[PDB]
Every structure is written in structure tokens, then in C-alpha cells.
């Protein structure tokens, strides 16, 4: 019922006069729809959904101008952080930036995001209230000052509360069956085993959208973290996503253990059991 | 398009003037008031945020909903005389000025003493000029140049030391002939204007 | 501290190139070129962030180009100048985090089909009237800069070799002499009003002073009259008790 | 700095039936820095035509790519993912295991 | 639709 627009930005410095790598990708929910990439030989914002391709030369020229503005801004941000931390000319460093909105079942909701990370650590991030900043170290405390004194916070909101939502909404409409579908998990189980007095149980879940999903594992109605081999939810690459949850059990004790598949696109949670 | 009141605001001092401005794109996130003296550059008055920005005599609000920003000068002062410029970003970082709203603040002549004196040139009376002074703000001045008689509109003059402010207008002719009590015959003179017995 | 532009005025012949220089506030990353024609608001030309030139408008032709080779000083360059190019060319440095523009005093480019039309001002001071003094016990000096082209001069009042503004009025804008004529030169009046007591001190010195902005050293001229170069034209007047 | 070692999963897009066209997936995630090399292997040689998602990251500030290819799985053939990163003494070769 | 305004650290 909830949705999200989010842009992800990745700037990497390249020692010795080299212009940095810059990658920008735009997601609506869990579905990438645009990318910029300094490496690639278009040097325009490229469409990566098929539903955003209908937008006219105006929008594209438009986004391109902004992404080229964003790129140059991050080339500078790199130079600046190298300065703040007194790091050297000879290291490569990484600025990551994510901003975007959340909407509700309503589509007229707000949660706003705009945060940074330098070399894998958090740097500065706009708090939930959208008027305040959280500043990691002194170096970030410098940026907090600049951005309080400049009223950056209040300028963000005009986008986060405004055009972000408006265009999120606009996209969810045109996306149609793509963006607003809720593909259900096809689920089953396995019994491969490399012992006599042990046995392995895998609770599979394939071909589901959106990505978010819950694969609990209870012994006789009590959740178990112990032995519960859970992998990151992975993309099948067709648009759906995959996730399995393993548990090792002793032989002849698999009549006890039950799976629990919660997903957004299910009528009720699907309790599961091994079958001879 | 940044649009703002076209019509010039001519007001007397003490008055309260309100400027309206509106921007087309909802995209804009940065909003400004600039102020510009006639033969000079634009200067920042005010960044415009939602919270009621209350300077001295100046207050501005922003209505993102109706994409509209305003300005309210409380006690009009002679020195508030300048074109007030509305500025927002457009699609990018780039910043775009509205066409401007001109403000002229007249002074309030409490003891008007309307007059038309003649003056003579320091070098051998190279020409002859007349000064129409000490008249009431509402008095408008027009001119006929079909003899080659040039006239200058109202011009306010503030003797800060003694708190005296006075309107004034100049007229002159190149040719040997003149008409000093006939210069502002083309304008709407105060009934009790003093043309003193010539020197 | 602020933004600084050179030159402040340039008169140029139709089809000659001009080059405006701008030295901004160091700390501000962005630098903006705007252009103003009398009566309209400032038109955007192009903005930089450091050496990078992110955007430029439709309005900026082929002829117009602007560099900022380091993060610092920028130049605008207009080629094969036309009359339509004539405008105030405004340079502004700008915060990236706020959008605050901090303008220089601009470069006035006036472009003419030839320079014959360019005349400096005649400046005359006119002493107060005894009539004015016998009524008001105040004395208005009048100053009259007549027959100059083009319309941009700067007129100031100097009492005892000190510029003062208290009790001065200058015409907001100069005045066409032949309103019907295209070639019409422009004229400007000013007023210094002082206590009749002050005018009736003979050891009191009044100068009205008009900075004309005309042609340069390297401007071409073989016409019978004097070269109409950027000059200060003054006019003098002394106190008197009679 | 922070450095983080790639987490690899190799898998098929659909359930793998011998001699039926599928997509072989390698999904590297949670690595830092962003510089990473991912080869898809058939019997220890390199598969030439291989495509990858544009670099993104999580809620955490750690990256994830999906390298993938056309392939037709058999009883006999062996399919692997070979990931190299500055966090690895040596490149890391993860075998595909359909049966899971 | 990208944010129109960019900011420096």
C-alpha cells in the first residue's frame, strides 16, 4: 500500500587528475527506472523501465541537466571531504548520497530522506522532522553549520514534501500493472541431507513482488534463530525476487518444524509443513 | 515566468505597500526578494521561508500551495524608493528574476509654500532657469518643448540636519526669450503659488 | 569583499567585439552572468560552479561566450557587437547552499553605428534667488548638465571639497532634449538647498561635478572638436551676502 | 576507511530443468569499496556475454550488483561465479548448486 | 524527477 521514490548516488575519486566515477540510479519502490553513468557513452539520463520511456524529449533534456549538475556537485564534495579529513591526493574515496520520499496507502503521506556517507561510514543525514541534521564527526559538523546557516533543510522539504511526492504519484499511475502489482510467493520445501542422524529443511519462496518478505521458523509454535540459515532476499532478475530459509534438524524430528510465509500480496500468512 | 504587480506604486510616507509575486513551476524550492536603486545593481532584501519573516518594517510569506510569495513594507520611508524584485530557481540551480515592481515614496509637505523663483548663471548669465519648489506631493508637472523649453519632473530633497523635506522641479530655455511665470502653466499649480516681483 | 567588474561603462562601434571582466567573492563557488535592458528585469545568461559552466540560456547567441578558467575570475566576451546588445551586463557570485546573488556594479555597454554622436556634458551652476531667500531663508543652487550622449553620467555636489547628499536632489533619469529625434542628446538637473546663512558665507565653496562615461584612449577620432573621452566636467560657485 | 568483503549468491532465475533455457544469476552484495570484478564461468572457462545491473546500495552504505547470463543447464556442465575484491587474498569462486 | 537544487558539503 505504501510506495517510495529514491535516487542513489555513488561518486568515487581516481587519483592523479582522473575525473571521478559517478553513477546515479532512480528507483520507484524496488524497480530501477533511470540511470546516469559517467563511464557509459550516452552522457544523458537513460530509461531503465519500459514505462518511463514514454516521457518526451523535454523530461529527458530536463533530468540530464540536473544529473550533470549533481555530478559536478559531487566532484567538488570529494575535494572538500579530502580537505576536511586532511586525506592525501593518492587515495580513492567514495561519497554515497540517497534522497527521496515515502507515501502511504494514501499516496498523500510523507517520510523524507536526504543523507550521505564518506568511505562507507555515515557523514550527515536529515533527521525525520526535516528541520534538523545528524553530524557524525567534526568534519560533518562543518557541513551541519553551512546547511543550518544556508537553510538547506527548509529548501529540501519543498522537493521532499512537494515535487518528489507529485512525481512518485505520477509514476505509480503510468507504471500501471508493473509498479502496482503484488506477485505472490510460490513456496515449497526440500530434504537434501549429508548425514544419517541429521537432516536439512529449506523453506523456499520464489517469483514474489515487492521484495519485502518474512520467513519465520518455529519449533512447535516458538520462533528459532538457532541453526536458521537465512540468505539476503535476491533478485530473480525478471522483476520478481527470491528468498529461502534453511534449518538443520535431527533425523525423524521434521514432523515438529513448521514454516511461516508473510508477504504483502497474501490474503493471510501461509503456514507450511514437510510432506512424504 | 516570475510575475509581480506591473503597475508602479507611488505612495506618500507613513503608507503601507504590499508586493505580490507568483512562480509557474511547483519545482522551485528557493525564493528571494531583491531591491534595486534606479541607476545601480540588485541587492538581497530577504530570503523567503514559510515562517513569517519579520524584519524591521519588512515582512514576507511564501504560499507553496498557491505558489505565491508576498512583501509588506509597514511604515513607508523616502529611502524605500527602488524596484523590488522577486527571484526563484527554475528547473535547476539557476535563479530567475521577475520583471520588478517599482516603488516611489513621496514626502508629506505639511506647510506647502509653492513658488517659482528665477536664478542666473555664475558665468555671465550663459542661460536663465526657474525653480518650482516647496509644493504639495499630489501636484503633477507636465511640459511644452515647442519653443525648446525643457522641464524635469518632481524631485525630493531631505535636509537631514533640520528635518525639512521639499519637492522641486527645474525648467529652462536656450534662446534669449524666457517665460518664468508661464513655465508650469501646462501643469496643475497650487492656487496660492508665489511668483515674486522679479529681481 | 564584494564582486568587482571592469570596465563599468564601455562605448563600442557596431561590429566591434567587447570583453567584460569580473572578480568575485572567493568563498562562493557559483558565478552568474545576467543582462538588464532599461525597464525589464535581469535576464539569465549562464552560471558556473568552480571552473564548470553548467547552464547557458537560449538568449546568449553564438557571438556571446564566457570563460571562468579557474574557480575564480570570469570574463564575458561579446563578438561583432550590434545595437540590440546594449545593456547592463551584471556579474554575481552566489552561495550553492543558499541561492543568494551578490552583484557587482555591472558593465554598461552602449553600442552605436558611429561615435560622431558622443558629446560630453556642459555643466552650469545657477546661484540662489534673493526672492527665494526673502521668502524662505533657504537658498537652492541649481546644476545643469546639458547636451551629452549617451545618457549615463554621474552628478555629485561638493561643498568645501567634501561630497554631501543631505539637501541634494538629482533627476532620477536624464532628459531627452529633442524627444522626437533618435540622435537626441540628454540633459540632467540637480539641486543643493542650504540655509540662506550658509550661502551668505563668502568663504563657502560649491562645486557641481559630472563624471561623463565616453570613449577610451584607444578609441578612433579625427573630427575637428575635442575627443569625447570619459571626463569630469565641473561648475563652480561661491557664497555671497548680497 | 571501511573495507567489506563481497557476499556472493549464485543461482538460476527459474527452477533449473536440464536442457531448458534459464538465466544464471550472480548477486554480489555488502562489499566496499565499489571496485569489484565478477566473471561467470562454464566448466572453469569464462562466459563472454554477461550483463550487470547499475551499481546501487542498501539502507546501510554497502553496494549490490547482479551479474547474469543466458544459459541452458545440463547434468554434466559446471557453472560458477568468480568474484575479485581488494578484501580477498585471492579471487573467490562460488559453484552453482541447483539441488538446494 | 531529480531535485532541481544541489548543495555542497
XYZ file of N, CA, C and O in Angstrom, chain C residues 132-240:
436
model
N 13.844 83.872 -3.326
C 13.798 82.585 -2.579
C 14.242 82.813 -1.128
O 13.674 82.172 -0.232
N 15.211 83.700 -0.919
C 15.876 83.926 0.397
C 15.014 84.868 1.257
O 15.022 84.700 2.498
N 14.310 85.824 0.625
C 13.452 86.849 1.294
C 12.105 86.230 1.701
O 11.347 86.899 2.450
N 11.817 85.014 1.217
C 10.568 84.253 1.494
C 10.856 83.144 2.517
O 10.099 83.035 3.502
N 11.936 82.389 2.302
C 12.162 81.031 2.866
C 13.312 81.059 3.881
O 13.363 80.155 4.739
N 14.220 82.031 3.750
C 15.592 81.991 4.328
C 16.193 80.599 4.072
O 16.785 80.016 5.014
N 15.994 80.078 2.854
C 16.744 78.932 2.283
C 17.145 79.268 0.847
O 16.407 80.041 0.190
N 18.278 78.721 0.399
C 18.931 79.034 -0.890
C 19.177 77.735 -1.670
O 19.927 76.880 -1.173
N 18.529 77.588 -2.828
C 18.678 76.433 -3.752
C 19.628 76.831 -4.882
O 19.229 77.671 -5.718
N 20.846 76.286 -4.874
C 21.716 76.176 -6.072
C 21.091 75.164 -7.033
O 20.519 74.155 -6.547
N 21.176 75.434 -8.334
C 20.740 74.507 -9.416
C 21.946 74.198 -10.297
O 22.747 75.122 -10.552
N 22.087 72.939 -10.705
C 23.157 72.466 -11.608
C 22.543 71.807 -12.834
O 21.564 71.042 -12.676
N 23.138 72.059 -13.997
C 22.524 71.823 -15.322
C 23.583 71.267 -16.273
O 24.323 72.078 -16.875
N 23.680 69.935 -16.350
C 24.471 69.190 -17.354
C 23.623 69.007 -18.614
O 22.590 68.322 -18.534
N 24.034 69.628 -19.720
C 23.235 69.757 -20.969
C 24.017 69.183 -22.151
O 25.266 69.323 -22.163
N 23.302 68.597 -23.118
C 23.849 68.148 -24.410
C 25.013 67.193 -24.231
O 26.150 67.587 -24.560
N 24.740 65.981 -23.730
C 25.703 64.852 -23.660
C 25.046 63.585 -24.225
O 23.807 63.467 -24.164
N 25.869 62.690 -24.784
C 25.482 61.382 -25.382
C 26.617 60.381 -25.150
O 27.774 60.670 -25.470
N 26.339 59.176 -24.589
C 24.988 58.749 -24.255
C 24.608 59.111 -22.812
O 25.383 59.767 -22.157
N 23.461 58.613 -22.345
C 22.637 59.247 -21.283
C 23.258 58.990 -19.899
O 22.788 59.619 -18.934
N 24.263 58.103 -19.797
C 24.878 57.696 -18.500
C 26.016 58.661 -18.131
O 27.108 58.577 -18.739
N 25.722 59.573 -17.195
C 26.698 60.398 -16.427
C 26.434 60.183 -14.935
O 25.384 59.607 -14.601
N 27.326 60.680 -14.080
C 27.183 60.647 -12.597
C 27.462 62.049 -12.044
O 28.604 62.522 -12.189
N 26.439 62.690 -11.472
C 26.491 64.095 -10.979
C 26.508 64.092 -9.449
O 25.677 63.400 -8.848
N 27.420 64.851 -8.855
C 27.611 64.959 -7.389
C 27.797 66.436 -6.984
O 28.226 67.258 -7.843
N 27.458 66.756 -5.734
C 27.632 68.090 -5.115
C 28.796 68.052 -4.136
O 28.777 67.196 -3.241
N 29.742 68.978 -4.279
C 30.954 69.063 -3.433
C 30.999 70.429 -2.741
O 31.275 71.438 -3.421
N 30.698 70.448 -1.441
C 30.769 71.651 -0.561
C 32.102 71.624 0.190
O 32.298 70.703 1.008
N 32.970 72.608 -0.072
C 34.311 72.741 0.558
C 35.086 71.438 0.344
O 35.598 70.883 1.340
N 35.095 70.938 -0.898
C 35.854 69.741 -1.315
C 35.452 68.501 -0.529
O 36.302 67.612 -0.362
N 34.192 68.429 -0.091
C 33.580 67.227 0.537
C 32.204 66.975 -0.093
O 31.292 67.803 0.130
N 32.063 65.880 -0.849
C 30.759 65.412 -1.383
C 29.771 65.309 -0.223
O 30.159 64.777 0.837
N 28.565 65.849 -0.406
C 27.431 65.721 0.547
C 26.160 65.413 -0.252
O 26.099 65.817 -1.430
N 25.210 64.694 0.365
C 23.913 64.270 -0.239
C 22.748 64.952 0.485
O 21.713 65.207 -0.170
N 22.905 65.227 1.783
C 21.933 65.997 2.592
C 21.554 67.273 1.841
O 22.462 68.060 1.528
N 20.275 67.422 1.496
C 19.728 68.623 0.837
C 20.059 68.666 -0.650
O 20.005 69.767 -1.235
N 20.353 67.511 -1.249
C 20.535 67.358 -2.718
C 19.328 66.622 -3.287
O 18.829 65.702 -2.616
N 18.920 66.984 -4.504
C 18.068 66.163 -5.397
C 18.632 66.200 -6.815
O 18.897 67.316 -7.317
N 18.814 65.022 -7.423
C 19.117 64.840 -8.865
C 17.939 64.117 -9.534
O 17.308 63.265 -8.866
N 17.639 64.476 -10.787
C 16.622 63.802 -11.636
C 16.936 62.314 -11.681
O 18.015 61.920 -12.123
N 16.006 61.444 -11.222
C 16.241 60.005 -11.211
C 16.899 59.507 -12.507
O 17.773 58.661 -12.427
N 16.466 60.047 -13.655
C 16.958 59.676 -15.010
C 17.119 60.948 -15.843
O 16.335 61.883 -15.705
N 18.167 61.040 -16.700
C 18.349 62.201 -17.579
C 17.186 62.423 -18.567
O 16.271 61.628 -18.585
N 17.280 63.484 -19.379
C 16.141 64.107 -20.113
C 16.534 64.338 -21.576
O 17.466 65.136 -21.817
N 15.822 63.689 -22.509
C 15.919 63.931 -23.975
C 15.650 65.412 -24.262
O 14.632 65.927 -23.777
N 16.537 66.061 -25.020
C 16.418 67.493 -25.414
C 15.421 67.617 -26.578
O 14.534 68.487 -26.498
N 15.545 66.756 -27.595
C 14.626 66.689 -28.773
C 13.877 65.354 -28.755
O 14.254 64.415 -29.456
N 12.771 65.239 -27.977
C 12.108 63.950 -27.763
C 11.791 63.211 -29.073
O 11.728 61.996 -29.056
N 11.595 63.961 -30.160
C 11.225 63.449 -31.500
C 12.448 62.813 -32.176
O 12.259 61.856 -32.957
N 13.650 63.332 -31.888
C 14.927 62.940 -32.554
C 15.458 61.635 -31.927
O 15.392 61.504 -30.685
N 15.948 60.708 -32.767
C 16.648 59.458 -32.351
C 18.016 59.820 -31.764
O 18.384 59.247 -30.717
N 18.727 60.742 -32.425
C 20.118 61.157 -32.096
C 20.112 62.025 -30.832
O 21.202 62.270 -30.288
N 18.927 62.469 -30.393
C 18.721 63.430 -29.274
C 19.737 63.169 -28.164
O 19.761 62.039 -27.637
N 20.536 64.183 -27.825
C 21.365 64.220 -26.596
C 20.446 64.357 -25.380
O 19.263 64.681 -25.572
N 20.984 64.109 -24.183
C 20.236 64.052 -22.901
C 20.762 65.139 -21.965
O 21.917 65.569 -22.136
N 19.919 65.593 -21.036
C 20.189 66.717 -20.108
C 19.715 66.350 -18.700
O 18.736 65.608 -18.585
N 20.388 66.875 -17.679
C 20.212 66.472 -16.261
C 20.314 67.710 -15.355
O 21.284 68.482 -15.506
N 19.353 67.871 -14.446
C 19.291 68.958 -13.440
C 19.490 68.373 -12.046
O 18.988 67.259 -11.797
N 20.144 69.119 -11.160
C 20.292 68.781 -9.725
C 20.095 70.030 -8.877
O 20.191 71.142 -9.423
N 19.853 69.832 -7.587
C 19.520 70.894 -6.614
C 20.244 70.610 -5.297
O 20.064 69.503 -4.751
N 21.052 71.565 -4.829
C 21.539 71.636 -3.429
C 20.858 72.815 -2.736
O 21.030 73.961 -3.207
N 20.084 72.530 -1.688
C 19.391 73.541 -0.856
C 20.083 73.617 0.504
O 20.300 72.550 1.131
N 20.437 74.831 0.919
C 21.175 75.119 2.178
C 20.561 76.370 2.812
O 19.844 77.113 2.091
N 20.779 76.559 4.119
C 20.375 77.764 4.889
C 20.912 79.009 4.179
O 22.079 78.977 3.751
N 20.093 80.053 4.047
C 20.483 81.339 3.427
C 21.748 81.873 4.119
O 22.597 82.458 3.425
N 21.879 81.627 5.430
C 23.078 81.954 6.256
C 24.327 81.301 5.636
O 25.393 81.970 5.607
N 24.193 80.059 5.146
C 25.301 79.221 4.599
C 25.734 79.755 3.232
O 26.948 79.783 2.956
N 24.768 80.109 2.385
C 25.012 80.745 1.069
C 25.611 82.140 1.281
O 26.365 82.595 0.404
N 25.294 82.778 2.412
C 25.750 84.150 2.767
C 27.022 84.062 3.628
O 27.237 84.959 4.465
N 27.840 83.029 3.402
C 29.264 82.956 3.825
C 30.141 82.951 2.578
O 30.099 82.010 1.798
N 30.945 84.001 2.341
C 31.699 84.107 1.100
C 32.865 83.110 1.074
O 33.378 82.843 0.006
N 33.227 82.570 2.244
C 34.322 81.568 2.411
C 33.707 80.162 2.385
O 34.246 79.257 3.060
N 32.654 79.981 1.591
C 31.992 78.675 1.360
C 32.015 78.369 -0.133
O 31.585 79.248 -0.934
N 32.500 77.178 -0.489
C 32.800 76.760 -1.880
C 31.841 75.658 -2.293
O 31.778 74.648 -1.590
N 31.125 75.859 -3.395
C 30.207 74.867 -4.001
C 30.717 74.498 -5.387
O 30.940 75.414 -6.218
N 30.923 73.202 -5.616
C 31.191 72.624 -6.950
C 30.132 71.567 -7.255
O 29.933 70.664 -6.417
N 29.481 71.688 -8.408
C 28.713 70.606 -9.064
C 29.595 69.917 -10.101
O 30.148 70.625 -10.967
N 29.668 68.581 -10.038
C 30.709 67.744 -10.696
C 30.029 66.567 -11.388
O 29.336 65.794 -10.686
N 30.202 66.456 -12.710
C 29.551 65.417 -13.564
C 30.645 64.534 -14.182
O 31.342 64.998 -15.105
N 30.774 63.304 -13.687
C 31.548 62.222 -14.330
C 30.799 61.746 -15.577
O 29.755 61.105 -15.424
N 31.296 62.104 -16.763
C 30.870 61.549 -18.075
C 31.564 60.213 -18.294
O 32.736 60.075 -17.914
N 30.874 59.279 -18.930
C 31.428 57.977 -19.356
C 31.339 57.882 -20.883
O 30.243 57.628 -21.407
N 32.460 58.160 -21.567
C 32.523 58.390 -23.026
C 33.378 57.351 -23.735
O 33.072 56.157 -23.617
N 34.395 57.799 -24.474
C 35.327 56.933 -25.240
C 36.622 56.737 -24.434
O 36.822 57.470 -23.453
N 37.466 55.790 -24.854
C 38.755 55.434 -24.204
C 39.916 56.151 -24.907
O 39.655 56.931 -25.850
N 41.145 55.894 -24.449
C 42.410 56.307 -25.117
C 42.436 55.743 -26.545
O 42.587 56.541 -27.496
N 42.240 54.426 -26.683
C 42.484 53.656 -27.936
C 41.238 53.712 -28.837
O 41.131 52.863 -29.744
N 40.358 54.698 -28.621
C 39.145 54.943 -29.453
C 39.507 55.896 -30.597
O 40.230 56.883 -30.335
N 39.005 55.616 -31.808
C 39.435 56.261 -33.082
C 38.644 57.560 -33.294
O 37.407 57.517 -33.174
N 39.339 58.657 -33.633
C 38.784 60.040 -33.684
C 39.705 60.945 -34.512
O 40.857 61.165 -34.079
N 39.213 61.439 -35.656
C 39.828 62.535 -36.462
C 38.736 63.541 -36.854
O 38.555 63.783 -38.067
N 38.054 64.112 -35.857
C 36.981 65.134 -36.028
C 37.407 66.435 -35.339
O 38.156 66.354 -34.347
N 36.957 67.584 -35.860
C 37.561 68.924 -35.596
C 37.539 69.219 -34.087
O 38.530 69.774 -33.584
N 36.444 68.876 -33.405
C 36.237 69.139 -31.952
C 37.069 68.144 -31.122
O 37.635 67.198 -31.718
N 37.125 68.351 -29.799
C 37.914 67.546 -28.833
C 37.365 66.115 -28.780
O 36.156 65.941 -29.012
N 38.233 65.137 -28.483
C 37.865 63.700 -28.328
C 36.939 63.546 -27.127
O 37.314 63.905 -26.016
N 35.701 63.026 -27.314
C 34.735 62.937 -26.221
C 35.018 61.746 -25.291
O 34.232 60.820 -25.267
N 36.122 61.821 -24.537
C 36.615 60.735 -23.638
C 35.943 60.881 -22.270
O 35.492 61.983 -21.952
N 35.888 59.790 -21.505
C 35.480 59.762 -20.078
C 36.196 60.897 -19.336
O 37.437 60.885 -19.295
N 35.434 61.857 -18.818
C 35.958 63.098 -18.192
C 35.055 63.495 -17.020
O 33.876 63.071 -17.003
N 35.607 64.254 -16.066
C 34.841 65.015 -15.033
C 34.660 66.451 -15.533
O 35.666 67.146 -15.673
N 33.419 66.863 -15.791
C 33.039 68.273 -16.095
C 32.411 68.878 -14.834
O 31.421 68.313 -14.333
N 33.009 69.948 -14.314
C 32.605 70.621 -13.056
C 32.078 72.020 -13.366
O 32.239 72.477 -14.509
N 31.403 72.629 -12.397
C 30.990 74.048 -12.400
C 31.046 74.580 -10.966
O 30.738 73.813 -10.041
N 31.500 75.821 -10.805
C 31.928 76.400 -9.513
C 31.015 77.569 -9.150
O 30.475 78.226 -10.079
N 30.884 77.827 -7.849
C 30.048 78.887 -7.257
C 30.489 79.126 -5.816
O 30.818 78.142 -5.124
N 30.495 80.388 -5.398
C 30.985 80.861 -4.082
C 29.842 81.560 -3.342
O 28.948 82.102 -4.020
N 29.873 81.552 -2.008
C 28.914 82.285 -1.157
C 28.954 83.791 -1.420
O 29.970 84.273 -1.950
N 27.884 84.506 -1.063
C 27.813 85.992 -1.121
C 26.662 86.484 -0.235
O 25.596 85.837 -0.234
